[PDB]
Amino acid sequence: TKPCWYWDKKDLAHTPSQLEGLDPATEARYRREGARFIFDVGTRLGLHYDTLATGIIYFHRFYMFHSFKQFPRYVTGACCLFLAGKVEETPKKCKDIIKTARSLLNDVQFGQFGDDPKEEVMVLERILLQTIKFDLQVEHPYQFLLKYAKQLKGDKNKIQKLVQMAWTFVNDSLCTTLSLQWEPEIIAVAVMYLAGRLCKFEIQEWTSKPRRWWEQFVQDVPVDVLEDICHQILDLYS
Amino acid sequence: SDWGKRCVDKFDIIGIIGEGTYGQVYKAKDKDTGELVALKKVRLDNEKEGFPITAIREIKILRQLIHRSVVNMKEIVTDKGAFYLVFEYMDHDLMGLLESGLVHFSEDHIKSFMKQLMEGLEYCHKKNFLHRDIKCSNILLNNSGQIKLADFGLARLYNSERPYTNKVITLWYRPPELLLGEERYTPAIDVWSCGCILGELFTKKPIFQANLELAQLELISRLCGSPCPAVWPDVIKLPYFNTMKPKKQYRRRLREEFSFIPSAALDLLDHMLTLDPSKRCTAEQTLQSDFLKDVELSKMAPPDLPHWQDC
Ligand SMILES: *CCC(=O)Nc1cc(N(C(=O)NCc2ccccc2)[C@H]2CC[C@H](Nc3ccc(C#N)cn3)CC2)ccc1N1CCC(N(C)C)CC1
Ligand SMILES: [Mg+2]
């Protein structure tokens, strides 16, 4: 009864947007624009980091079954955030999300909302709920970043700096389809592996003994997996 | 898995089962297999905030709970509008059965009923979930003899290692700590309501029948003794302890007003109807009582459950 919410990179190269003729870099920017729209809107309303991430996860999954050439990105983004508030028990009125959405977008960007932006978001809630198969509960790499870093004993300033850079990497990872690739536990260790290389830190010295320090947090995670997640996060800065 | 895509036209509405929070409950049958189902209509056409957060709550709780004694949500269906929540069809509820007068439950029946109910509640409690709406109407019984727990819309997660809403259970099954204003309560509110229905299965009438909270508190205190620091040292911390007090300091007389029920059943009822929730029975140890220790369900028989009512 629990559906599978992960795709290969070959499956991610054949999204409904690509089949309808959209460019891969254009879809990747649509996901960036849309995910960072649910991000900017959510903070202005004072929403919680799981609530923003849940709306973004709904957003990336919605466009595995629908193409951007049929569903505007920002209307879907505002709809996903509106649904994420109820599921995460931090509900915001749709009227506030649109009054906020109008305050951050253009005249042509907000033009996707039509003459009645409220209803245009309301009718999409039915499409989104069926698209997410009513699998409302999701986990984000934030909780695993804190959960795994708690078991690290060592320099308090170096460990605290580690989770500070990995946290922003979890923010940046939400603009990519990494959510549709690896479980939240894989992303949490990936941002710790990445942040440990940029700080010149040796994480295993804060664990037991020396070493693949994450084999005690996540099962069977080859390094090639973690270095692939790091690439897609670092590419956001290119 | 892929839920929400199938249409309601695959079902035929037989009749109206009841009226839930989001809509009416419909008895329906599958046009493809013949399975009876219960459909909960969740309207969103007119709602101001789209899909009700109350139904979203009920959805993401029931999709974490899989158990023989918990109603399983089969699927979700639309129309082409609104959505319908598909549940496994149960044949009866215990309230409708007792109010009819056509059913008589033996202690062999009550032991089987309590073993399934306490087994399902222990599963929900082990997952850190309060039901917060246990009553006779929400206990569903099959003609095969299977017991199930239903209507999880008011169920909430519980902090195992924080405060919640005070008044949550219908008054006839609400524990004394909520009447006195407790807001950081425990699963012990659920094992209390089950105490009220354990006694109700031997009386066909709810144990504590009042309409106001104060008029309720004295009714329990007339049976279980008045809440005092001697048997419940934390009464002095609940808000309305002094504002809402019984007429006199009654003595517990549960072991005699229910002297007709079996000893093992009376010993379990006393442990489940204790005033102090810190001293109240745990759902796990309710199945370790002398009344439910050696009750193998496969060696039981379904009860006298009727099939038609002037409904
Ligand atoms: C014509 C009979 C009828 O449908 N009316 C009805 C039936 C019931 N239920 C009973 O089990 N007991 C009534 C009874 C008692 C003793 C002897 C015979 C009949 C239903 C209880 C729910 C059952 N299914 C169920 C419910 C919920 C879920 C979930 N999730 C899953 N399955 C099916 C049997 C209760 C109420 C009523 N009425 C009749 C009057 C109606 N008015 C007039 C509109 C309201 C409900
Ligand atoms: Mg009910």
Residue numbers in the entry:
A (entry chain D): 20 to 229, 232 to 259
B (entry chain A): 717 to 796, 807 to 887, 890 to 1039
Original authors' sentences:
Herein, we report the discovery of YJZ5118, a new, potent, and highly selective covalent inhibitor of CDK12/13, by optimization of a structurally distinct reversible inhibitor 2. YJZ5118 demonstrated similar CDK12/13 kinase inhibitory activities to 14h, with IC50 values of 39.5 and 26.4 nM, respectively. A mass shift consistent with the addition of a single molecule of YJZ5118 to CDK12 was observed. The covalent binding mode was further characterized by the co-crystal structure of YJZ5118 with CDK12/CCNK complex at 2.5 Å resolution. The structure revealed that, in addition to two hydrogen bonds formed between the 6-aminonicotinonitrile moiety of YJZ5118 with the hinge residue Met816 and one hydrogen bond formed between the urea group and Asp819, the acrylamide group formed a covalent bond with Cys1039. CDK12 and CDK13 were most enriched proteins in precipitate. Target specificity of YJZ5118 was assessed against the CDK family, showing over 100-fold selectivity for CDK12/13 over other CDK family members, with the exception of CDK7.
These kinases cooperatively regulate transcription elongation, splicing, and cleavage and polyadenylation by triggering phosphorylation of serine 2 in the C-terminal domain (CTD) of RNA polymerase II in complex with their essential partner protein, cyclin K (CCNK). Additionally, the distinct cysteine residues near the ATP-binding pockets of CDK12 (Cys1039) and CDK13 (Cys1017),17 present an opportunity to improve target specificity through covalently targeting.
